[PDB]
Amino acid sequence: AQRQFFGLTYNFYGQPAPLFDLNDLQELAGCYARPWTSRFSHLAISTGSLPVWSARYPSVASRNIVVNTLLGAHLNPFAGGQITSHQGITWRDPVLSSLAPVPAIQPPPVWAVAENVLLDSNNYPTYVLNLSSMWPINQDVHIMTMWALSDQGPIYHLEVPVDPMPAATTAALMAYTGVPIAHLAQTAYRFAGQLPQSPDSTMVSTIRWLSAIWFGSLTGRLNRSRTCNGFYFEFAKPALNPDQAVLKWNDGARAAPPAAAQSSYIRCISPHWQHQIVEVAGALMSQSVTAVTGLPALIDEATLPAWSQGVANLTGNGQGVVPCLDYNPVPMAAARHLQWRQDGLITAAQEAQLNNDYTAYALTIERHLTAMLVANPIAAGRMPIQPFNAADFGQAGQTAAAVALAQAMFV
Amino acid sequence: NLFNVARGNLYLVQTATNGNWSPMAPVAAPPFVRGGPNVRVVGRFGTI
Amino acid sequence: LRWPGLVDPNYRVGTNDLPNRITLYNSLYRYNFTYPTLDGIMYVRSAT
Amino acid sequence: LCDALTLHIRETYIMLLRSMHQDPTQIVQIVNECANNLLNSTIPISLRP
């Protein structure tokens, strides 16, 4: 299958120890203190449209943002070989399941707190000699890596071949029809995180084809009148829950396979991704693919945070790197509505209408995060919000280039 | 009161004392008044 | 010819022939659906 | 073994179904709105692969 994941631990943002305390270990949903196979656990049972977030976890990406620093704080293996222990907490045994208090009689060595520790994976020989059991850990660490190599939104990866969708892909995809993007992220992740799959498996090339097929919809290029291969995502009114996507199937005028491969990493600069279940789902839904199949190439050092500068085997700067086109939710959806008007889906009156109904919605996202960062600073201890600063929220980077990527990805 | 009809509101807090408990004439300020710091109301339906 | 899937080494999971020749040994996709049957609680609005 | 014709017909019906699949979670809103808020509910639904 695959066994060689190069990771990278979360940044401290200038804080002493990793941003999380003792209580985070016995609060995680699902399997006790087991951080593995968590993420989409608090969403296992849907009650309604309202995004699941409590007091300690003020947002959607709050559950994951916490399991990240909690994850890295206990990742001496792959980066040292030992098991160590942070604040009296360690793994049960070599398989690395749930975290229990440091066992007596033979306690592990105390972990040396460090920021951004490069994970080699092969450094821990027990991993490959017990792959079929500790496989989820590979998918999860990969997630933490994509989240760590960015101070503003998880950097996933789109692709799309030069030729049309395989004959085994079109038959597998016709099963995730009436399924929201929020759920596609849950089924995608829970798939690549329980049993060692192959890089050329049917469910892998289809889930990847489902992610890049989602980006076009998010940009508006793959609407109701322009399918990639009969699949798209119908968006509801932004004032009436814009989180709803669903992979609808039609028989309209399909697009056409591009002249070349459109491999490209994408990011969401705007801190809006934090509270948007749709953005967090789109990110983690793509990460499920780069898990079973390590990074197709290296990531561009063009922008990114000041700590992801020249990583071991993650972010480069030469010619073997792939540019990262980052966008912004508000301008992206503002350009997404503009696509619908061009082909005649919406009236020229609903053009400037959907913009005001969405910008008001995205405002609620901004009014929420700003009010949560102040409530939960950073020097306090944890980092459920991630210090984004209020100077941003609307400084859209090359979002205009991400849109031009979708037009090129589906000619 | 002279007709059995207290006004104000009713608090429900687990105070387990030993002194002169006094439900009616309450000494000191009432804990957490409406619209106080972190004191959320119950949305009309009251659904959980 | 009837069995391009079973015999031929260049088969491609999911590839038919359909319009022209009914293939026998193919590559179907056995599903395992569950049919959730909702039954929830239902709160009224409350006078005011 | 499964005659491409039959395998193709079913692969069509599986789609006919998915086509008309309804996101279970949205069901709360449909009832909430269809009733004009007079009646508000909640329906837990275990999302699965």
Side-chain angles (χ1 to χ4, degrees), chain A residues 359-395:
Chain A
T359 197
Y361 155 71
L363 186 61
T364 288
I365 303 296
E366 174 186 17
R367 292 291 190 163
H368 190 217
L369 279 298
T370 293
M372 289 300 98
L373 210 176
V374 179
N376 297 285
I378 186 68
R382 290 150 60 249
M383 184 185 89
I385 287 298
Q386 187 172 83
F388 48 73
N389 207 279
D392 299 79
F393 276 135
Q395 78 303 134

CSV table of all heavy atoms in Angstrom, one decimal, chain A residues 359-395:
chain,number,residue,atom,x,y,z
A,359,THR,N,-22.8,38.4,1.7
A,359,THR,CA,-21.9,39.3,2.5
A,359,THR,C,-22.4,39.6,3.9
A,359,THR,O,-21.6,40.0,4.8
A,359,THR,CB,-21.6,40.6,1.7
A,359,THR,OG1,-20.5,41.2,2.2
A,359,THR,CG2,-22.8,41.6,1.9
A,360,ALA,N,-23.7,39.4,4.1
A,360,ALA,CA,-24.3,39.6,5.4
A,360,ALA,C,-24.1,38.4,6.2
A,360,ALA,O,-24.0,38.4,7.4
A,360,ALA,CB,-25.8,39.9,5.2
A,361,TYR,N,-24.1,37.2,5.5
A,361,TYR,CA,-23.9,35.9,6.1
A,361,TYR,C,-22.5,35.8,6.5
A,361,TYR,O,-22.2,35.3,7.6
A,361,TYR,CB,-24.3,34.8,5.1
A,361,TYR,CG,-23.6,33.5,5.4
A,361,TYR,CD1,-23.9,32.7,6.5
A,361,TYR,CD2,-22.6,33.1,4.6
A,361,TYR,CE1,-23.2,31.6,6.8
A,361,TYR,CE2,-21.9,31.9,4.8
A,361,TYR,CZ,-22.2,31.1,6.0
A,361,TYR,OH,-21.5,30.0,6.3
A,362,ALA,N,-21.6,36.1,5.6
A,362,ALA,CA,-20.1,36.1,5.9
A,362,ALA,C,-19.7,37.1,7.0
A,362,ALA,O,-18.6,37.0,7.6
A,362,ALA,CB,-19.3,36.3,4.6
A,363,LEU,N,-20.6,38.1,7.2
A,363,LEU,CA,-20.4,39.1,8.2
A,363,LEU,C,-20.6,38.4,9.6
A,363,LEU,O,-20.0,38.7,10.5
A,363,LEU,CB,-21.4,40.2,8.0
A,363,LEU,CG,-21.2,41.5,8.9
A,363,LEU,CD1,-19.8,42.1,8.7
A,363,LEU,CD2,-22.2,42.5,8.6
A,364,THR,N,-21.6,37.5,9.6
A,364,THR,CA,-22.0,36.8,10.8
A,364,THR,C,-20.8,35.9,11.2
A,364,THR,O,-20.6,35.7,12.4
A,364,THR,CB,-23.3,36.0,10.7
A,364,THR,OG1,-24.4,36.8,10.6
A,364,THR,CG2,-23.5,35.0,11.8
A,365,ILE,N,-20.1,35.4,10.2
A,365,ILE,CA,-19.0,34.6,10.4
A,365,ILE,C,-17.8,35.4,11.0
A,365,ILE,O,-17.2,35.0,12.0
A,365,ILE,CB,-18.5,33.9,9.1
A,365,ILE,CG1,-19.6,33.2,8.4
A,365,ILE,CG2,-17.3,33.0,9.4
A,365,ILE,CD1,-20.1,31.9,9.2
A,366,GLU,N,-17.7,36.6,10.5
A,366,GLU,CA,-16.6,37.5,11.0
A,366,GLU,C,-17.0,38.1,12.4
A,366,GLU,O,-16.1,38.2,13.3
A,366,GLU,CB,-16.5,38.7,10.0
A,366,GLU,CG,-15.5,39.8,10.5
A,366,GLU,CD,-15.5,41.0,9.6
A,366,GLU,OE1,-16.4,41.2,8.8
A,366,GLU,OE2,-14.6,41.8,9.7
A,367,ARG,N,-18.2,38.5,12.6
A,367,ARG,CA,-18.7,39.0,13.9
A,367,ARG,C,-18.5,38.0,15.0
A,367,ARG,O,-18.4,38.3,16.2
A,367,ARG,CB,-20.1,39.5,13.8
A,367,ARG,CG,-20.4,40.7,12.9
A,367,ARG,CD,-19.8,42.0,13.5
A,367,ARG,NE,-20.2,43.2,12.8
A,367,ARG,CZ,-20.1,44.4,13.3
A,367,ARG,NH1,-19.6,44.6,14.5
A,367,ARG,NH2,-20.5,45.4,12.6
A,368,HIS,N,-18.6,36.7,14.6
A,368,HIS,CA,-18.5,35.6,15.6
A,368,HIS,C,-17.0,35.3,16.0
A,368,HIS,O,-16.8,35.1,17.2
A,368,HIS,CB,-19.1,34.3,15.0
A,368,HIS,CG,-19.3,33.2,16.0
A,368,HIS,ND1,-19.1,31.9,15.7
A,368,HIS,CD2,-19.6,33.3,17.3
A,368,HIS,CE1,-19.3,31.2,16.7
A,368,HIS,NE2,-19.6,32.0,17.8
A,369,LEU,N,-16.1,35.1,15.0
A,369,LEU,CA,-14.7,34.8,15.3
A,369,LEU,C,-14.0,35.9,16.1
A,369,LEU,O,-13.2,35.7,17.0
A,369,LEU,CB,-14.0,34.5,14.0
A,369,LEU,CG,-14.1,33.1,13.5
A,369,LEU,CD1,-13.6,32.1,14.5
A,369,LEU,CD2,-15.6,32.8,13.1
A,370,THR,N,-14.3,37.2,15.7
A,370,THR,CA,-13.7,38.3,16.4
A,370,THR,C,-14.1,38.4,17.8
A,370,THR,O,-13.3,38.8,18.7
A,370,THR,CB,-14.0,39.7,15.7
A,370,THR,OG1,-13.5,39.7,14.4
A,370,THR,CG2,-13.5,40.8,16.5
A,371,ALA,N,-15.4,38.0,18.1
A,371,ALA,CA,-15.9,38.0,19.4
A,371,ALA,C,-15.4,36.8,20.2
A,371,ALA,O,-15.5,36.8,21.5
A,371,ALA,CB,-17.4,38.0,19.4
A,372,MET,N,-14.9,35.8,19.6
A,372,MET,CA,-14.4,34.6,20.2
A,372,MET,C,-12.9,34.7,20.5
A,372,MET,O,-12.5,34.2,21.6
A,372,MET,CB,-14.7,33.3,19.4
A,372,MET,CG,-16.1,32.9,19.3
A,372,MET,SD,-16.8,32.5,20.9
A,372,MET,CE,-17.6,34.1,21.3
A,373,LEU,N,-12.1,35.3,19.6
A,373,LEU,CA,-10.7,35.5,19.9
A,373,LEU,C,-10.5,36.4,21.1
A,373,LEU,O,-9.5,36.2,21.8
A,373,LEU,CB,-10.1,36.1,18.6
A,373,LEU,CG,-8.6,35.7,18.3
A,373,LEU,CD1,-8.2,36.3,17.0
A,373,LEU,CD2,-7.6,36.1,19.4
A,374,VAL,N,-11.3,37.4,21.2
A,374,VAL,CA,-11.2,38.3,22.4
A,374,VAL,C,-11.5,37.5,23.7
A,374,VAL,O,-10.9,37.8,24.7
A,374,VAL,CB,-12.1,39.5,22.2
A,374,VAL,CG1,-11.9,40.4,23.4
A,374,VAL,CG2,-11.8,40.3,21.0
A,375,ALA,N,-12.6,36.7,23.6
A,375,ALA,CA,-13.0,35.9,24.8
A,375,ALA,C,-11.9,34.9,25.1
A,375,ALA,O,-11.6,34.7,26.3
A,375,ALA,CB,-14.3,35.2,24.4
A,376,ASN,N,-11.4,34.2,24.1
A,376,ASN,CA,-10.3,33.2,24.3
A,376,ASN,C,-9.1,33.7,23.5
A,376,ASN,O,-8.8,33.3,22.4
A,376,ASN,CB,-10.8,31.9,23.7
A,376,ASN,CG,-12.0,31.3,24.5
A,376,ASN,OD1,-11.9,30.9,25.6
A,376,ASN,ND2,-13.2,31.4,23.9
A,377,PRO,N,-8.2,34.5,24.2
A,377,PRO,CA,-7.0,35.1,23.6
A,377,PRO,C,-6.0,34.0,23.0
A,377,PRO,O,-6.3,33.6,21.9
A,377,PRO,CB,-6.4,35.8,24.8
A,377,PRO,CG,-7.5,36.2,25.6
A,377,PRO,CD,-8.4,35.0,25.6
A,378,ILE,N,-5.0,33.7,23.7
A,378,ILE,CA,-4.0,32.8,23.2
A,378,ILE,C,-3.0,32.5,24.3
A,378,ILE,O,-2.5,31.4,24.5
A,378,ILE,CB,-3.2,33.3,21.9
A,378,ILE,CG1,-2.3,32.2,21.4
A,378,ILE,CG2,-2.5,34.6,22.3
A,378,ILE,CD1,-3.0,31.1,20.8
A,379,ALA,N,-2.6,33.5,25.1
A,379,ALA,CA,-1.7,33.4,26.2
A,379,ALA,C,-2.4,32.7,27.4
A,379,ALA,O,-1.7,32.4,28.4
A,379,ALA,CB,-1.2,34.8,26.6
A,380,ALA,N,-3.7,32.5,27.3
A,380,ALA,CA,-4.4,31.9,28.3
A,380,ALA,C,-4.0,30.4,28.5
A,380,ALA,O,-3.9,29.9,29.6
A,380,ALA,CB,-5.9,32.0,28.0
A,381,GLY,N,-3.8,29.7,27.3
A,381,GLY,CA,-3.5,28.3,27.4
A,381,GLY,C,-3.7,27.6,26.1
A,381,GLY,O,-2.8,27.2,25.4
A,382,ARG,N,-5.0,27.5,25.7
A,382,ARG,CA,-5.4,26.8,24.5
A,382,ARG,C,-5.5,27.7,23.3
A,382,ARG,O,-5.2,28.9,23.3
A,382,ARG,CB,-6.8,26.2,24.7
A,382,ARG,CG,-6.8,25.0,25.7
A,382,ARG,CD,-8.1,24.8,26.5
A,382,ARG,NE,-9.3,24.6,25.6
A,382,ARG,CZ,-10.2,25.5,25.4
A,382,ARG,NH1,-10.2,26.7,26.0
A,382,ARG,NH2,-11.3,25.2,24.6
A,383,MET,N,-5.9,27.1,22.1
A,383,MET,CA,-6.0,27.8,20.9
A,383,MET,C,-7.1,27.3,20.0
A,383,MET,O,-6.9,26.8,18.9
A,383,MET,CB,-4.6,27.7,20.1
A,383,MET,CG,-4.6,28.5,18.8
A,383,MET,SD,-3.1,28.3,17.8
A,383,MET,CE,-3.6,26.9,16.8
A,384,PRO,N,-8.4,27.4,20.5
A,384,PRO,CA,-9.5,26.9,19.8
A,384,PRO,C,-9.9,27.9,18.6
A,384,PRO,O,-10.7,27.5,17.8
A,384,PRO,CB,-10.6,26.9,20.9
A,384,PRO,CG,-9.9,26.8,22.1
A,384,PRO,CD,-8.7,27.7,21.9
A,385,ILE,N,-9.3,29.1,18.6
A,385,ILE,CA,-9.6,30.1,17.6
A,385,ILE,C,-8.5,30.3,16.6
A,385,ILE,O,-8.7,30.4,15.4
A,385,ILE,CB,-10.0,31.4,18.2
A,385,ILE,CG1,-11.4,31.4,18.8
A,385,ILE,CG2,-9.9,32.5,17.2
A,385,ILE,CD1,-12.5,31.0,17.8
A,386,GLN,N,-7.2,30.3,17.1
A,386,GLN,CA,-6.1,30.5,16.3
A,386,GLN,C,-6.0,32.0,16.0
A,386,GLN,O,-6.9,32.5,15.2
A,386,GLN,CB,-6.1,29.7,15.0
A,386,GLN,CG,-4.9,29.7,14.1
A,386,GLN,CD,-5.0,28.7,13.0
A,386,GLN,OE1,-5.5,29.0,11.9
A,386,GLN,NE2,-4.4,27.5,13.2
A,387,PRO,N,-5.1,32.7,16.6
A,387,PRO,CA,-4.9,34.2,16.4
A,387,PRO,C,-4.8,34.6,15.0
A,387,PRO,O,-3.7,34.6,14.4
A,387,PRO,CB,-3.7,34.5,17.3
A,387,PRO,CG,-2.9,33.2,17.2
A,387,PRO,CD,-4.0,32.2,17.4
A,388,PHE,N,-5.9,35.1,14.4
A,388,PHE,CA,-5.9,35.5,13.0
A,388,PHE,C,-5.7,37.0,12.8
A,388,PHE,O,-5.2,37.5,11.8
A,388,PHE,CB,-7.2,35.1,12.3
A,388,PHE,CG,-8.4,35.4,13.1
A,388,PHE,CD1,-8.9,36.7,13.2
A,388,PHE,CD2,-9.1,34.3,13.7
A,388,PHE,CE1,-10.1,36.9,13.9
A,388,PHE,CE2,-10.3,34.6,14.4
A,388,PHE,CZ,-10.8,35.9,14.6
A,389,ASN,N,-6.0,37.8,13.9
A,389,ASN,CA,-6.0,39.2,13.9
A,389,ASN,C,-7.2,39.8,13.2
A,389,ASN,O,-7.7,39.2,12.3
A,389,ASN,CB,-4.7,39.8,13.3
A,389,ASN,CG,-4.2,41.1,13.8
A,389,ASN,OD1,-4.7,42.2,13.4
A,389,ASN,ND2,-3.3,41.1,14.8
A,390,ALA,N,-7.6,41.0,13.6
A,390,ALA,CA,-8.7,41.7,13.0
A,390,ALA,C,-8.4,42.6,11.8
A,390,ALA,O,-9.2,43.4,11.4
A,390,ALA,CB,-9.5,42.4,14.0
A,391,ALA,N,-7.1,42.6,11.4
A,391,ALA,CA,-6.7,43.5,10.3
A,391,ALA,C,-7.0,42.9,9.0
A,391,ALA,O,-6.9,43.5,8.0
A,391,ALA,CB,-5.2,43.8,10.5
A,392,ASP,N,-7.3,41.6,9.0
A,392,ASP,CA,-7.7,40.8,7.8
A,392,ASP,C,-9.2,40.7,7.5
A,392,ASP,O,-9.9,41.7,7.5
A,392,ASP,CB,-7.0,39.4,7.9
A,392,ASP,CG,-5.5,39.5,8.0
A,392,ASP,OD1,-5.0,39.8,9.1
A,392,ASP,OD2,-4.8,39.3,7.0
A,393,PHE,N,-9.7,39.5,7.3
A,393,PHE,CA,-11.1,39.2,7.0
A,393,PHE,C,-11.6,39.7,5.7
A,393,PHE,O,-12.7,39.4,5.3
A,393,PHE,CB,-12.0,39.7,8.2
A,393,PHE,CG,-12.1,38.7,9.3
A,393,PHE,CD1,-12.0,39.2,10.6
A,393,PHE,CD2,-12.3,37.4,9.1
A,393,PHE,CE1,-12.1,38.3,11.7
A,393,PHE,CE2,-12.4,36.5,10.1
A,393,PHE,CZ,-12.3,36.9,11.4
A,394,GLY,N,-10.7,40.5,5.0
A,394,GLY,CA,-11.2,41.0,3.7
A,394,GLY,C,-10.0,41.6,2.9
A,394,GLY,O,-10.2,42.8,2.4
A,395,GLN,N,-8.9,40.9,2.8
A,395,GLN,CA,-7.8,41.4,2.1
A,395,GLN,C,-7.4,40.5,0.9
A,395,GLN,O,-6.3,40.4,0.5
A,395,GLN,CB,-6.6,41.5,3.0
A,395,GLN,CG,-5.9,40.1,3.3
A,395,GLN,CD,-6.9,39.1,3.9
A,395,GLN,OE1,-6.9,38.0,3.5
A,395,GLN,NE2,-7.7,39.6,4.9
